[PDB]
Each structure stands twice: as structure tokens, then as C-alpha cells.
Write a protein that binds this ligand. Structure first.
Ligand code: 3CO
Ligand code: 3CO
Ligand code: 3CO
Ligand code: 3CO
Lengths: 156, 217, 120, 152, 216, 120, 152, 217, 118, 151, 119, 216
């Protein structure tokens, strides 16, 4: 039944987690442990995935988050006003973030992280100002003052 | 229920505005610009090409010039007056034929012809689509429900530089006497990407799972 | 102390567009439509937009798309040099060892700046 | 060719670096086993139909002398009533457990299971099997040879 | 010498020493395996194409039809009760203009050895066993085979005692061909279903061959 | 120590075959060709030959293939009970949620013992 | 401290992200199995002494009613001659294989093995066990209760 | 809701009883026996050894015989009357000294001297303890808060066969004139395993986290 | 098919391993002997830990007689052998063991079949 | 040697340690909890307190290229191309989790030295790429490679 | 964009680092002996205040020197200078599982004034 | 040659070509590094043991005290403003009958190079950086060092601009020893804190040494 089929598909997905493997953790190995093959693999640009083997997945659409739309607009405006060109953004966003964050975090999460990154890297804001601004936003929410269009001020 | 992303978004935006990098108005202007984007201009371009041989030739040879006919000037339509920063100004139209079928992807990221087509689909941005299409296009297209004769040349276009593409599908059977509006109607977003072909009676992308956002636009 | 020029791009591209604003700055093209070229395996350290899957493969130039600084330079704020960009068509069989002869006409088209090209 | 070879090795190597949330399991308490996990762990190893997998360029493989001898041994044991093919499949494709099932080679499992049935049904003690392995090793090491595998 | 070769010797010697089976039984079985191959299956398909009545028999009673090509599922094997692992219930799947069959054993590697020979290395792979039943069109395409979307592609999963061979539709360009000419284009791959017969092609498509350390 | 009967199978199947040697032992079949059946999700602890991907799915019986002990029993040396085996055809769309409508005629045929079947 | 709690939760989560060269195994060919891998794959799972591991804050655990019942069942089966403790250990701590050995709970293995011995020595058919499982589920589903785990 | 373990436990027990493998009485008898098990007998044995040199010699040479003095007969006390099936009948007592300190483990599983000590600690059964103790005893003991002079021979005993052990720690200072009961009181389960030493005033194992059971006994 | 009374009839009132006493005959080794652990095949089952293989230790006690676990775990109790308690210096087992703790040892039991004079 | 095989075995079985391995392929924002958000945005060099196993610490001879890399990094700071703190941030954090633990200690120092030259535009990435190509050919041709390889 | 490559050398030559920042932080907010808690400030991109110290309370044992915070210096921002403090934590306050047997063990590390607040 | 050696050559040539630093600077720095080692630090400890007043100076002002052993943290390095990575704030941690220090840099490999030389390979290992601050008793035990449970073991994590060296307590059996004899037993490991000085032991405990492809 619908309930059985759901358990079946849940099962098929869960067993992938148990796929046996030879898991070799890397803990800053010596130079003599790095082959040319490994050197090229580590110094690759994360965004270059064309041709890599992957499985079939049922493609889905996704609603745009309000913060995603604002993040997109911020990135284009920063380029519009000369803080960077789209190519600078791509390099910082899709490559400089590194392998782990590149696939571990969400698409727009990287756009956002990189927009904050360019403000700091080109010294338009100090890292101190960014950190303080983060604390400010948190306090604004905890105090009940609301956070832009994401959360309205607390009522009665 | 504010996430770390929304908190950081507010921080970045407020800091950018405070430092005079861009104004609050600039941000609203860009959002209003995005709201005007959609797949209609591109579908319209295909219908026009289907009805006008000379325009079709123009599309194939100079997509930028041809796009003007549907009201989308890649240079002046965007707020910047020098094209959007990320989509650039070099649209190319890929014309399918009885012996050629195109499908587009950006293996390096999500490069898409936003000015004339709108925002890219979630799956188009996926590492999965970006890894597979260039190597197993027939397999991926089959999953989308599309199959072409083995003799037909399937051509995968990988927009890795400044060029952006839209696919001009072959005009389907059963559209005799159809008007421009009727024709453009069956040229869906998916058709313009190449993962589907236009079919009389089908005026919407194939239904597929929709992942909900926490705080949707 | 560093000062970044935030008006240069706009002053240069407004009313013109990108990459139109670089037109003519590359000079004479080293290759032309129809030439068979092989993709050089240049170092990809830090940045590159020439996919690994094309390295060492041979394809045909089908169009000189435009002139522009290479992404390798643009991505780091270096726009002083401009070169030709070419649209190249590869036979799928030449990229993927396993590609079936049944679909022998399948191809892949993508763009590559002049620096990565050498006569086949 | 050399460049293409390096390109394909690369495409294969980066797969090893695919990021993941890797949670090691060290005999978790019963309160950590959901029904979903219980069903996953108690699954029958050979039932893989429908699981997502990637495309691979299928290849043929030459048959090893020992593989042919193992096949004959397993069928002869069945022929002579030591077991039915179904008993073999259950022991060979399920009883070996998830790790050996996918970590070891196809015929490796056939051979191990052939040795297994001899012991489980007490036709030979594990001691006899262990001692036979030891003697075989010495035989080879002494330069005496090993059947059709190695001449003396 | 590898660990597998040492263990193989240990197991065989112990089995013979305990009298579970004889040295003679082992040689006899290896000899039987050596006579197996795709030829009989190929000839069954050819005869079916050349005799509608035989084809009917193939579709309804694979075991009886197999005798016509010299393969008695019960008495050809040394046991006289069929091979222990292949059993005695061969079914022939007839392709048609609207139906195309492809075979697999998701649980292992079940194959019609008596009439077809030993299974391909890829057929036994976990990969083929996971994907075929769910993405048959995609897997077949990788093999270079594509069929009309309206055609029914039927995947046969031989999970019990039945074994299958595929009878492909006869290809055009074979008018007047004899039984030998037709049998010659029906390859092992055609009988599995990952390929269709074609005039001029008399061997499975070339694929990489993994070499054995000490081949038969 | 236990004594294993190593001659039983040979004495029962010689000159007859497997599963021909079990013919008639199942009695009357509970279902017949054409019946629509759903696959019961019986516990599969330790062993089963009724794939997980078929559980809860509905298909059509297209043939009563033969009689034999279920693998669940035979794999453990228990052959006292014999039942009917059925070849069942499933529509791919009923197994895989993502299957394309373009290939609406695709199916999958497999064999399942009577114990897993219930009228649909 | 809610901060200290987040810190320790952090120290634990980053471990999931420890980088590694993750090589999945899909029935490799014999030529891919070295003697080192052969020994590692054919090892007895219960032999873990000397293996490197991290420091963890050792804890006590309350006994589950089903665990006490399982223990009593296993000892009673031994008492009455169905098996000896050594046969149990071999089936329970070794035959279950590497994945289940560390993925499932201690007593979960005791229980699975008790069910195993009943089937392996043919005191119950697998069919009877599967049917008993079903009967047990139906009993709970119909509000008929389940021993002293669930009152009717 | 009941867990899959509880469902299966019921299935196995009912089937075993139905088939006459063991009776419902047998099952209750065993649970009752287990319920009576505890560390007191082992603690008493150590106290007796501290007070009687001759008995100490007996403990060191023949733990089985010595165990009888505290009412625990490894052969006849269990319901089987041939020793418990899993613990067997060969108890050995390890006597610490000013130059020797023992700690026990079963790297192969959880072998523990149940008849005289009771049920094994959850941590004693962990792959972690079983992996580390034999190789880094000083480190593991330090974690339990126990440290010994470097010159002192720390001996790890791995119960891999039929012998089971209990540790007889050295009598702590500050117990002059103490009665057998007073002494037994500071010999906790942990002292008998070897991860702790007895101390005047300490009459319970060190407090450590307690993982709760879904449906406890 | 299975004899479920044998064990009880054999060990009741005697105990295990007491019920096997004397069945191993003369011991091949004695207290004080230096022995090295044979790296016997451990396929399917063994209770002689891998960490002891090839190491040399000193026998400090003949603990009892019993069939090997390797046989018992498979229902084969026909053969009985001597079991020995062996002491190893930790440094001989773990290469990294500190010289500071040079007196530390490990004691475990091993059936005769795994022993050879060092 | 048996002991050698024993220790090799103890190291090999660690590779087979069972686990629930969840590959991450650009999850949607709704799949990122605060805990994961903090874990992903952490600075890689902050490892104090993380659980790890005991290992037999060893010394390592210094490679000529390592000595040269160290001197290059200190000279760049000496001459004001960067301060040691800018190096640490780029070298021990900006490189990201994977490279941070997958590559060698001095490997990260060297990559970062090349990185600062490009990020501060003292050389174009093109100049860096070209220099590497020329170097590779230099060694390949038999011309030699500094003090590492004679002609 | 021009980078000033002589600034650091002109400032620290013959003086040293952090000696070259001496006196630039003004009056210290804390003093030796004060008990302080470590604020859990956002660590995005960079920080030299270990996660393991966050939210813990320790004792100031020395005002070591004055210098720009690493958070600023690591990005070329040296305009602001603050006091750095050497703080001692009881191991038990950091690690929950620490044994009472070693109740006197401590850990000493340096933290810039920005992360501190009166305990 | 390795990819590392190729890249090292590329970076150095580029830096020199762009005039970031000179070839002379590079040689000068390598020469400076070549003069570094544990001797000055060992001598500082010896002098402190032999002079209570100097010991007090060490404990209160490491930089000033360092000058007595020939190491001026500001002027000894070629920069004349201290090395860029080690800075100019050395602190000496004095052990006592109730206090024993052990140093680490959890964030990296911070080490007092000017007075002690280059850091050990294990000192920079993620493993040492992860474990020492949390399990010092265990890590030190692995090094063969054990202290009374009552003694305060203090781990110093050099996460900012301060660098530390450990001044261990003077061991018994050194009565009347000269400065040279005492300095001789104060090894690098002693100055880091993973070992304590012992009469007769003048070298770090032997441990495995991983060889370089192209050493020295
Ligand atoms: Co893109
Ligand atoms: Co099979
Ligand atoms: Co145990
Ligand atoms: Co450091």
C-alpha cells in the first residue's frame, strides 16, 4: 500500500548509508604521501564537476526563500556598483569556499557567505564590524524588535 | 523562527548600505527588475522564428539582436544599462532540426539566460545535473521523458564563459494555422532548456516534486 | 590604505555591454572557424573555467564568439589583457571512452579562451 | 592519451573526496535504533534491486583457474547432497553479511561459503580446515608446488 | 599463489578426503562446463525464426524446445536431475514489434547456463543488479540499445527457479538466410537482452576485458 | 553427531528434475492467470527471495510456473511444504514513483510464491 | 550552561566532517584483493583488542526488560542443550558480520542470534518465525497487548 | 508502541517454549537467579582475604574453592547445577600487591564473573573499552581517575577463554581494626574489575552518566 | 537429530571445564616455559586475539583442560587439550609502549595448539 | 614478520569501521540546522578538544623545498607583502576543511605563499600558471630544477 | 590598488611586535585577579579564541601586551589596538568528564579584551 | 621531483622577479634558520637553576632574560623587529613541586623558534593539537611522563603573540653540576614539556623518524 511503498522507498534510501567502503581519514599526511594524482585532486577547483559519476535522482523544483531573493539582489547590486565583477564572485563563491562547504552548504548559502566575504576581503568593513553586526541582528530578534521582513516586532 | 541565513542576510545588506556600496533603492530596483523576468519573451522569440524564416536566420546568427524583437535588450533592459553583471550580453539561440537536438547546462555553476528566460530551476543548479548531462545526456533526457532517434545529433551546450543559450525546438506536428500566441504557449521553460520538446496541448512544465521554502517569496 | 576603483566597469560598459566593451582589444585571432584544436592542460591552481573533462581532447572551432579578458584574469581583477574566445564542438566519443557507437553523432559544445588552444 | 588518462583518473579520484556526514557506529544503545534502521540492518544483503547507483563502463573478466575449480566444487557438493543451491545462496549471498558481501569478490564468497558448509554441517572440524590451510602454505613455501596453480 | 588459490585447494582436498564428492565428479563437472556456451541458445532462436510452430513451442515450453538444440535440462548435466543451480524451468521470452525483453537476477547472478554458458562479469555486478529493474532504458542506452517509447520494455528478474533467454525479433536484411546464417548473428548479449541481432555482427560488442591473474 | 541425509534429493529428482519433482504436491492453486494481486510485506528476517522493491505493489499473474518449497524453507533444509509459484507482471510506474509517462508501457516480470500473494 | 552545551555539540558534529578518501567497495575483482585485505575481510569481528579508538565518557545503562528476557532466554537455551555458550559467541559475535556487529546494539545481537539458532538447528522453520513475528504485530495492532511490554 | 526488539523477543520466547526447548518456569527461574546476583560475595571474599592470610593464599591458588566460603559455588549455585553456561566454573582471583595492580577486560566480548559479581557494566561491554584497555591501560585507568607509580607492574587480564577474574586490591590505609563488613563495604564492583581502588568512606562506584532504557526493569 | 541432553549429563555436578579433566593427557608445556604464539588461520572463528600473534610470552599456569573454542563453537568436543595462562610484557605487544612503564604486562589464556617453544 | 602483519592488520581494519555515511550534495537551506551551520562555517584550524586516537608520534626530516617555503613565507612578511596573521588566516582557515587536513602542513604554507602573490595582484594568475608550465617543462627537458635536480 | 609594504617595518624596526603597539589600547578594562567569562562572539571567517573556551569562566593572571585583535590584523586592519589577557581555566570547567582525581589541572591561554565580560 | 618542488621554485622566482624580496633576503633567512636550535633555551634553564635572581627575571620578563643566552627577540632575526611569525613576547613557564607545564598551539604550530629552533613534526600534528588540552595526563603518559595527581598540570595554548618555553624543576642527582652539565640534560622535549630532565639523558627520547624525499 501507500504506507508500504513509502517504507520500501525509505528502505532503499537508508541502505545507501550502509554501503561498505574503505574509509581512510586524512590527518595532514606527509609530503611523501601525496602523489601527483592526489595533488591534482586536492588543488582542483570545486566547481568543475562535469563528467563525475552520479546516481539518478528525481529532480524537483524549489520555492525561493525571501532571504535567497534578497541575497541574489545584494550580489547583483554589489557588482552593479563596482564592488566586484560576476567573475570575481564566482571564483570566491564556487571555488575559494573549498570542497567541504561547496557541497555541504546550500546554493544560496554560498552566495550569501561570499557577499559577506567580499565586504571584508576588500576592506569595506572590518571583520569586527561584521561580527558585531551579526550580534546586533541576534539581539534585535531576542529583544522582540523583529528582523526586517523575516520577523515582525512582538505584539501583545 | 529566524535562521542563520536570514540573520546573515540582514547583516550583509545593512552593512553594504551603511558603507554606501549600494542604496536601499538600488536593492528594491533590482528586485523589481527580477519580478519582471519570466520565460515568455524566449517562447515568443521561438514562435516568431517558427513563423518568419528571416527572423529565424537572425536568431541563429545573432541572438542579441533577435532578442530585441521580443522586448529584451540584453544591454539596456537591466537596471545597469550594461547588461546584468552575471548574465552578460551574449545570448546565442541554438536551433534544433530533424537531425539536431540541443540541451543546455552550466557544469561550473548555474549560468542561465535570465534576462530572456527568468530564474533557473532548482534542479538545473544541482551538482547531479551538472555532473551527468554532459556525459550521459541520453540517459538524463530519458529520465525527463525525452528520447530522440539514435541517428539524431544530441548536442550538449555547456555555458562555461559569457555566452548564455536558449533552445529553439523544432515546430511540432498539429500546429497548422496556429497563431504566434498559440505557438509560444507550448514553448515552456523546459523546452527552452532542452529537457523537453513542445507538444500541442501542453502549456506548462511537466509536474515534478516541489520543495517548499521555510519563508517563501 | 588600498583604494578600489568602483566606477571603472560601469564607465566602460554602460550603453555598450559586456563583452562588447572589449571588442577589438584582442587583435588578430590565432585560430579560425573550422580549425581543429586540442585543449592544453594548463595549471588550474586557484581558478579556471576550462573544464577538466576537455583537457587533452581535440575539437573543432565553429565560431569566434567574442573578445574578453580570460576568466582566469577577470576573477582576480586583472582586465589589462584581452583575448579571443572560441566556441568548440567535441565528438562525445572523444571525451568519454564508454560512449556508444549507436549515438556516434552526439556532440558537446562549449567555449574556451585562446590560451588553451593549440593546432590539432 | 596520457592527458586523457590523467583526466579520467582525476574524475575517479575526486569521488573519494565527496563530502559527507560520516557517523561511525560503535554498538549504539537500543534507544538509538529506529524502526527504519532496524529494517536496514536486518535486511537480506543480496536484495539490492532499485538502489541508486552510478553508470559504469561494464567489462568482461577472464575466469581464474581457482574460480572454475570453486564453481565445480560448489556444484559437485550440491550434486552429492551436501546442500541444495538454495542453501548455498542463503549462506553465500546473505549470511556473509553486508561488509563481506560487497567488499570481497563474487567467487571469493562462493569459495568461503564452500568451506563454510563443510564446517557447519560437521563434515570437517574447523581445526581440520585450519590445519589444511597451514599445510597448503608450507607446501607452497617449501617449493613442493600447488596443484595446477604452481609447479614445484 | 594467492589466498584464494590456497583456500580452493584446501576445500577441494578436504571435500574429496571426506568423500563428499569424488575427484572424478570434479573433473566431470569441469568437462561439462567446458562444453557450455551461447551456441545452442542462438540455434534455438534461429530455428524459432525459421519455424513458427517451433517458436510457439519455445514460448509455451522452453524446456521441451531446448531438446531440439541438444540441451536436455534434466539429463544433459552430470546429475541427471538438472544442474543444482540452474534447475529445469527455462522460459523463452519472445520479443515482438511492441515488446522487448532484458534479463537480470537482482538477488545474484541466475543465468541459463545449460543452454547459454557462463554469465558475463558485468551481469553479476551489484551495479547492473541495482539499476536495470529501475532504469532499464538508461542502462540499455549505455549498452547502445534504444527502443521506441511506445514499445513495452520488460525486465525479467529471475529470482526463483526459472531461467530465461531472450528471443529477439528477426532483423530486416535477412531474407532467405539459412539457420546457420541466422544463428550466427544471435550473440550472448542478444540472448540476455542488452543488444539486438544485426546482419554482419557476429560477436558481442567490444568491451574492456579485465585480465585474470592465472586464467583458465 | 547429527546425520545428514545426502541421498534424498538425488533419489527424489533423478530422471525427473527440479522443480518437476515437486509437481502436484502443492494441491490447488489459490490464484489463477489474470488475477490482480498485491505483494504482502512479510517479515524478511534472515532470508527471502521476494525483493523489497515489490512489497505492497500490485501486479497481474500471467502464469503459474511450477510447484516447489518456498526458498525461505528450502534454504534451511525444510522441504516438507510445497506451494505454487506465480510469474507476476508489474507496471514500472507502480514500482518507481519517478518513472516517466513517456514510457507508460514498461513492465517488470518476476516470480513469487503463493504465501506472499493476496487478492488485490 | 547553554553555551557549553553548544560547544560540546559543536566538537561532536565536526567529527562527522572529518575529511577522508572514501572508497566504496562494489564486489571488486580477485586481483584487487591483497593478502592484507584478505586477512582484514576474513577476520573474526569480535577481535578488536589493540585497535585505536578515542576517549569517551563511559556510562552505565539501565537494563531493558527485553534485554533481561533475552539474556534469560539465551542461558535457558544453553541450559536445556540447544547450544553451548561457545556456539552462541561464535554465531553472535562473529557470524553476524562486521556491519551488524558494530551497527546494532549488544543485546540486539544476542536476540537475533537466539532467533538464529532456532532456525539453523531446525527447531522452527524460518516460516514459523516470520509468521510468529506477524502474529506478534497483529496482537499489538488489535490492542490485544504484548506480554509485559504492552498491556491490552 | 513496542520496539522491534520487544516484538522479536516475544516471538523467540514463545516459539522456544512452544517447541519445548525450555519451559516458562525455566525462564522465570533464570531471571530470579540473575536478580539475586550482585558484587557483595566478591567484596566479602576480599575482606576475608585481607583478614586471613591462609584464606588469601587459597583465593590466589584456587578461586573456585575460595568462592565457596562466601556462599557462591560456581558449579552448584546456578540453576543448571553445572555452572552457568556463559560464565563456566574457573574463577581466578588476582591479588594486587605494592608492586602489582590488575585490571580486567574481555576484548572478545563481555566475559564477566557474573556468579560472584553480578551483571557487567554497560561500559565494560563497549568496543571502546575492549579496544583500548589492553594497549593503553594507564591512559584508560587515568580516565577513571586511577594512577599508579610507573614502577608498579600494571597487569591487564583479558578473559578470552573459560576463566573469569575478580581483582583483590591491596588493603587501603586507614582501616585498622575494621570488621569484615566494614572492609567489604569499600570493595565496590569497580574495585573488583580493577578500574578503581578501595578507599575508606567510598562505598559506591564513582558516579558517571546513566543512559536510561526505554522500558526499564 | 540434535542431542540436547549430552552436555547436562556430562557436566551436572561436575562443572565446565572440570568435566574434561584428564582428557588432554600430558601437557606439552609447563609453567616457566617461554612460548611463541603461532599465527594459525583464524577463518570463521578463533579466541586467540590477533594482537598476540607471533609474540613471545611466559606460561605462568596450566589453568585447565578443555576442547578448543575453535571446535566447541561448532559442536565438536571429541578432542581436549591443555589451556595455558600466558604473560606478555606490554612492550613486546605494542611497539610504542613507554620504557617508563617497563614492568607492565598482559595475561591471557591460550590453548596448546597455538604454542611453540620460543 | 608476523608482528608487522599484526600491526598492519590493526591499521587496516580501521578502514572497515562501519558507519552511516551520508553524502552531502548541496542540501536545501531547510536541511541546515543551526548546529550544522555553525559546523560548516567554523574556522578549520580550531581543533582543540576534538576527540582523536593515540598514535605513535614521530619526527620527520625537513625537505629542502619545505625549508625554502618557510624562508619564502618569512621573507614575504619581512618585506611587507603580508603579516604572519594574514598568512595564518589564509593558510590555516581560508583553505577549507578538506585541503586543511588532506594536504601536508608545508603544502598549505606553499600554496598560500602563491595565493598571496595573486590575491594582492603582485602577479596575475596567468603569470603563476605560465611559470608552473615553464617549470614543469624545465624539469622534463633535463635542464634541471634549481638545487633539487641537476642538469 | 597599491599595497603599502613599508608600514610594518617602519613601525616595528628596532622596537618589536607587539611592543610597537604599546600604550595604544589605553586603560585596560580588566586587571589581574578578575574572574571573566568568555563571550561566544560570531567566529565567521576568522578567530583565535578557541571554541573550547566559549562560555567558560577563568581568572586573569596577566595583562600580556597590547595589539590589534587577530580578527582585524588578519585582514590588514591595525587601526584599533586592545589589551590581551592571559587567562587560566580549571580543566573541569572546560571538560565535563575531567576526573576529580586531577582536580588541580588547569589550562592557560590568551584572549583579547573584546571576548571578556565580568564573571 | 614533486609537484611541491615545482611550485616552490615557481613562487620564489616570481617573488624575486617582482621584487617582493631579494635572492639575498632568502639566503639570509635560511642562514638565520640554520643557526637556530634548543641550546640557548637549555642554557637559560641551567642559568635559572643556578641563579635565583635570574630565574625571577625569566619568570617575569622572558624577552629580557633571553638576552643573557645570546638571543635578542627583536634584533637577532634579520628583520630587526623580530621574526614575523614568532613575534617578541617570550614567556618562561617555571615548573615547581606543585606545577608542571606542557605547551601546544591548538590553532597551528606556534613555537619559540628564535630560542628553541624548529618545531617537532608531532607538535604540529592535528592529533597533538586536538588531544593535549583535553587529555594532558594521557598524552604525557604516552610520552612516558607521569606526575602526582595532586600536582597541577597546566597546559599552555599559545594562540596569540606569546611563545613559551618550559623551565622544568632541577632534577636530583645534579648536585654541584656546572652550567654546561645542567644545560646538557635540558632537551627540546623538556622545553616543550613532554619530558623532564634526567641525569645521563642528553637527547630526546628516540622515536620513529619519517624520512624526507630530499632532506637537509
Ligand atoms: Co553557472
Ligand atoms: Co542469481
Ligand atoms: Co565476553
Ligand atoms: Co601555531
Amino acid at each position: 500500500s501507500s504506507s508500504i511503498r513509502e517504507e520500501v522507498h525509505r528502505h532503499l534510501g537508508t541502505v545507501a548509508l550502509m554501503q561498505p567502503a574503505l574509509h581512510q581519514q586524512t590527518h595532514a599526511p606527509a609530503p611523501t604521501e601525496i602523489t601527483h594524482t592526489l595533488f591534482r585532486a586536492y588543488t582542483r577547483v570545486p566547481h568543475d564537476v562535469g563528467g563525475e559519476a552520479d546516481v539518478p535522482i528525481e529532480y524537483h523544483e524549489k520555492e525561493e526563500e525571501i532571504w535567497e531573493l534578497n541575497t541574489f539582489a545584494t550580489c547583483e547590486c554589489l557588482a552593479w556598483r563596482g564592488v566586484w565583477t560576476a567573475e570575481e564572485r564566482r571564483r570566491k563563491q564556487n571555488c575559494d569556499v573549498g570542497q567541504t562547504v561547496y557541497l555541504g552548504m546550500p546554493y544560496y548559502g554560498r552566495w550569501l557567505l561570499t557577499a559577506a566575504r567580499i565586504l571584508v576581503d576588500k576592506q569595506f568593513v572590518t571583520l569586527t564590524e561584521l561580527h558585531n553586526k551579526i550580534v546586533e541582528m541576534r539581539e534585535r530578534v531576542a529583544s522582540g524588535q523583529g528582523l526586517g521582513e523575516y520577523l515582525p516586532p512582538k505584539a501583545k | 523562527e529566524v535562521s542563520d541565513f536570514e540573520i546573515l542576510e540582514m547583516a550583509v545588506r545593512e552593512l553594504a548600505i551603511e558603507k554606501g556600496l549600494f542604496s536601499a533603492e538600488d536593492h528594491r530596483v533590482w528586485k523589481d527588475y527580477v519580478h519582471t523576468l519570466g520565460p515568455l519573451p524566449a517562447a515568443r522569440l521561438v514562435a516568431k522564428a517558427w513563423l518568419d524564416p528571416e527572423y529565424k536566420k537572425l536568431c541563429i546568427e545573432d541572438g542579441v539582436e533577435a532578442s530585441k524583437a521580443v522586448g529584451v535588450n540584453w544591454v539596456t533592459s537591466p537596471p545597469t544599462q550594461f547588461g546584468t553583471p552575471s548574465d552578460y550580453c551574449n545570448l546565442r539561440v541554438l536551433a534544433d532540426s530533424p537531425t539536431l537536438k540541443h540541451v543546455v547546462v552550466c557544469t561550473l555553476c548555474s549560468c542561465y539566460p535570465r534576462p530572456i528566460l527568468g530564474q533557473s530551476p532548482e534542479w538545473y543548479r544541482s551538482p547531479n545535473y551538472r555532473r551527468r548531462l554532459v556525459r550521459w545526456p541520453r540517459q538524463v533526457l530519458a529520465e525527463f521523458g525525452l528520447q530522440l532517434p539514435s541517428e539524431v545529433q544530441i548536442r550538449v551546450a555547456d555555458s562555461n564563459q559569457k555566452t548564455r543559450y536558449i533552445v529553439m525546438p523544432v515546430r511540432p506536428e498539429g500546429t497548422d494555422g496556429w497563431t504566434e500566441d498559440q505557438l509560444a504557449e507550448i514553448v515552456t521553460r523546459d523546452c527552452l532548456i532542452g529537457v523537453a520538446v513542445p507538444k500541442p496541448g501542453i502549456t506548462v512544465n511537466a509536474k515534478r516534486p516541489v520543495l517548499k521554502a521555510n519563508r517563501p517569496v | 590604505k588600498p583604494v578600489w576603483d568602483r566606477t571603472h566597469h560601469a564607465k566602460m560598459a554602460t550603453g555598450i555591454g559586456d563583452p562588447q566593451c572589449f571588442k577589438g582589444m584582442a587583435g588578430k585571432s590565432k585560430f579560425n572557424v573550422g580549425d581543429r584544436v586540442r585543449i592544453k592542460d594548463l595549471p588550474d591552481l586557484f581558478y579556471t573555467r576550462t573544464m577538466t573533462y576537455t583537457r587533452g581532447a581535440t575539437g573543432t572551432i565553429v565560431r569566434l564568439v567574442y573578445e574578453s579578458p580570460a576568466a582566469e584574469d577577470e576573477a582576480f581583477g586583472n582586465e589589462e589583457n584581452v583575448e579571443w574566445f572560441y566556441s568548440i564542438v567535441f565528438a562525445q566519443k572523444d571525451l568519454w571512452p564508454e560512449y556508444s557507437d549507436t549515438f556516434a553523432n552526439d556532440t558537446l559544445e562549449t567555449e574556451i579562451p585562446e590560451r588553451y588552444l593549440e593546432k590539432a
